[PDB]
Amino acid sequence: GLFLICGITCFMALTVFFWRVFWQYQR
Amino acid sequence: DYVSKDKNPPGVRGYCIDVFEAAIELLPYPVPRTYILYGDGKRNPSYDNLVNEVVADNFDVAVGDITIVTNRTRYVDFTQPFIESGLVVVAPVKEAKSSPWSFLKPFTIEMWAVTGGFFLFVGAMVWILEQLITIFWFSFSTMSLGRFVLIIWLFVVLIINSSYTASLTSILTIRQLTSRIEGIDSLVTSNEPIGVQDGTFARNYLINELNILPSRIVPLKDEEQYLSALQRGPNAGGVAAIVDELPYIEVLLTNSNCKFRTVGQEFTRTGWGFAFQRDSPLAVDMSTAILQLSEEGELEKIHRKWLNYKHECSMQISNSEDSQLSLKSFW
Amino acid sequence: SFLKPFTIEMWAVTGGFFLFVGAMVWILEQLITIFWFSFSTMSLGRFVLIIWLFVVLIINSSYTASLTSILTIRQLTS
Amino acid sequence: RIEGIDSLVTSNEPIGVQDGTFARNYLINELNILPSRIVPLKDEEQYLSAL
Amino acid sequence: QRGPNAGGVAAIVDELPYIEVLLTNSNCKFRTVGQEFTRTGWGFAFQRDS
Ligand SMILES: *[C@@H]1O[C@H](CO)[C@@H](O[C@@H]2O[C@H](CO)[C@@H](O)[C@H](O)[C@H]2NC(C)=O)[C@H](O)[C@H]1NC(C)=O
Ligand SMILES: N[C@@H](CCC(=O)O)C(=O)O
Ligand SMILES: N[C@@H](CCC(=O)O)C(=O)O
């Protein structure tokens, strides 16, 4: 269960980074 | 070894017989004598029914391993104690392990790969926010969105710290608070099955005086089953501890390996002796023989003939069960 | 009796190899020793700081799990 | 602590019973309890002072 | 009260039903540290074969 929080938090920041990459393409 | 059936023309063999023989030639009396065996060849004979066969005058004298108890002194007369004995408690020794396996023990072998694995995969999450090139992240992870990764990863390490303590405590307490005995008072209260030898006063001394249930005391026939009732331990039908006299136990340590040790002192120190017919004048004759047999050292010289078996083998010597963090755990 | 956890053969190994890994800070550095106390508090020499953090993280646990193994059974040795 | 009769058999503490009952000779005969542990008790005021 | 020093003794070895009289008279400042390491019992002493 404690490694589930290791999965939910890290996969959340992939989406924020990919939205940053999708905004990197907006320049 | 102490007293036994024999095919020789005397008829019996042992140690107490040759103490009895070597007191006869100190007396001025030519004494005709015979040797009548008493019990079966399957178990020990009940020594309360050996001394009962001296009160009822079937035997004029019981020579053997007869132990002075305060009924046996009341109905027959004994000589002086020619050897000293006491009830001890023999028990398995402390096998306290020591390893780097005992270091890494509080987690499963799969957990040491998951924890070390989810420091690099979490450490690879740093590269998303960011041999010699891979060491650059360790200079950055010494102390935005990447700070929120460090907040959750902090409370992970504040749990793997706070569980590895709780599984190194829960080993180092249950290793101490396991089923232990370090005295006869430990053996009275901890309600484990106790082995004794068959046909003794030790069966009817623990029941009568130490207040032990009759269902805990388990009889045992011979010296091979005195091991198989301790190799199985308190479970699997065996017993926790054997309570025997001291000169029986100093045979059993040498006959076996260095896996047992007398965990207490003698809690009833009486001694052995010859059981005569009551108020027979031979008792004052052989009390003067033995006290002259002892002071001339012949009582010790016979002891080296049969009972030469004595090896200390200090596995543990009243070891303090305390902190004692293993030397190989930090190897 | 406060010092009773970690029996006395394993204290000088701890404080002695405290200086041995402490010597690695001086390698990757009166005036040199005062700056040797700088990085010892908090690259390739910065990777030992990860591992030495793990080592005292267990000695913190083992000293607690030895002291809990004393203050509990000494409430249960009658 | 005791949380059952099996906790009370093994933990070798003195057990109170009431006087003149079968419970004295049922714990001895069946549950294998020592006769020195079972303590008789007369009336309902001493059923408090023994606890 | 003097303890091991000042001429006093460290521990008195007595029989059991004397300790019961002693510990009720005092407060519980003294403890029976172990158990009966030789338990025999009292009795009357008649002359031999009477
Ligand atoms: C005390 O020792 C004696 C002898 O072993 C036992 O008392 C009685 O002894 C006579 C011998 O003349 C027997 O016939 C009786 O049967 C014995 N009494 C009983 C009740 O068996 C007695 O066994 C010993 N005391 C205890 C408590 O075992
Ligand atoms: N000393 C024990 C010996 C018993 C036995 O060898 O069986 C006794 O006199 O009862
Ligand atoms: N039910 C209990 C009552 C005993 C009593 O009241 O003393 C019995 O029959 O033994």
Return the residue of C nearest to B166 by Cα: C65
When computed from its CA atoms, the radius of gyration of chain E, rounded to whole angstroms, is: 16
Q: Give the 3-state secondary structure of residue B276.
A: strand
Please, are residues B222 and B302 in contact by the beta-carbon 8 Å criterion?
no
Pairing of strands B194-196, B217-218: parallel
DSSP, residue by residue, C22-76: HHHHHHT--HHHHHTTTTTT---TTTHHHHHHHHHHHHHHHHHHHHTTTTTGGGS
> What distance in Å separates the CA atoms of residue E17 and residue E14, rounded to the nearest whole number?
9
The torsion of the CA quartet B266, B268, B271, B272, rounded to 10 degrees, works out to: -110
Contacts of B45 (CB under 8 A, 6+ apart): B38, B39, B199
What's the CA gap between B322 and B225, in Å, rounded? 33
In 3D space, the residue among B51, B30, B302 whose CA is nearest the CA of residue B200 turns out to be B51
Are the CB atoms for B73 and B281 separated by under 8 Å?
no
Of D12, D32, D36, the CB nearest to B189: D12
Q: What atom of ligand 2 comes closest to residue B47's alpha carbon?
A: 10
| B277 within 8 A of B60, measured Cβ to Cβ | yes
Chain B CB contacts of D27 below 8 Å: none
Task: Report chain B residues whose CB lies below 8 A from the CB of E49.
Answer: 279
**Interacting residues of B63 by C-beta distance below 8 A, sequence separation 6+:** B3, B16, B17, B20, B274, B275
Chain breaks of chain D after residues with C–N above 2.5 Å: none
Say if ligand 2 is within 6 A of residue B273 CB.
no
Q: Which ligand is nearest to the CA of B2?
A: 2
Smallest Cβ distance to B168: which of C9, C62, C72?
C62
Nearest beta carbon to residue E40 from set B70, B185, B210: B70
Q: Report angle CA B174, B180, B181 to the nearest 5 degrees.
A: 160
Secondary structure of D10-46 as H, E, C letters? HCCCCEECCCCCCCHHHHCCCCCCCCCCEECCCCCCH
d(Cα B116, Cα B320) in Å, to the nearest integer?
A: 37
The Å distance, Cα C74 to ligand 3 centre, comes to 43
Q: How many angstroms separate the CA of residue C44 from the nearest CA in chain B? A: 7
Report the gap between the CA of B60 and the closest CA in chain E (Å): 19
Q: How far is CA E41 from the centre of its chain?
A: 13
The verdict on A16 touching B (C-beta cutoff 8 Å) is yes
Residues B159 and C57 sit within 8 Å (Cβ to Cβ): no
Q: DSSP string covering E1-50, please?
A: ---SSTT--S-----HHHHHHHHHHS-TTS---S--SS-------PPTT-
Determination technique used: cryo-EM
Q: Which of D10, D12, D32 sits opposite B215 (nearest CB)?
A: D32
Q: B200 in ligand 2 pocket by Cβ < 6 Å?
A: yes
Which DSSP letter does residue B277 get? P
SS3 of residue B196 by DSSP: strand
CB contact under 8 A, A3 and B148: no
Residue in B208, B267, B240 with CA at minimum distance from that of residue B85? B267
From the CA of D19, give the closest atom in ligand 3: 7
CA B44 to CA B201: how far, in whole Å?
Answer: 12
Instruction: Answer for the pair B209, E16: CB distance below 8 angstroms, yes or no.
Output: no
- Distance CA(B70)–CA(B223), nearest Å, equals 28
- Measured CA to CA, the distance from residue B65 to residue B79 in angstroms comes to 13
Spacing, Cα B243 to ligand 2 middle (Å) = 11
Q: Residue C18 corresponds to which tokens in the numbers above? A: 């405290």
The structure tokens 């004295």 sit at D24
Q: Which segments of chain B does DSSP mark as H helices, in order?
A: 16-24, 48-55, 72-75, 100-103, 111-117, 120-129, 146-172, 184-189, 203-206, 225-228, 246-255, 282-295, 298-301, 303-306
Cross-strand partners of B218: B195
CA distance B182 to chain C (A): 11
Between the alpha carbon of residue B289 and those of residues B19, B83, B84, C38, E33, the distances in Å are 11, 14, 17, 86, 42
Q: Which of B49, B52, B55, B200 to mutate to test the pocket of ligand 1 (most atoms within 8 A of CB)?
A: B52
DSSP label at residue A8: H
Rg from Cα positions in chain B: 31
Q: Is the CB of D22 under 6 A from ligand 3?
A: yes
d(CA B190, CA C61): 32
Residue E39 contacts B where some CB pair is shorter than 8 Å: yes
- Backbone φ and ψ for D32, nearest 5 degrees, come out as 55, 65
Size of interface B-C (CB pairs under 8 A): 67
Q: How many CB pairs under 8 A join B and D?
A: 8
Contacts of B326 (CB under 8 A, 6+ apart): B96, B97, B98, B99, B102
C37-72 as b/e: b if 16+ CB within 10 A: eeebeeeeebebbeebeeeeebeebbbbbbbbbbee
E35 touches chain B (CB under 8 A): yes
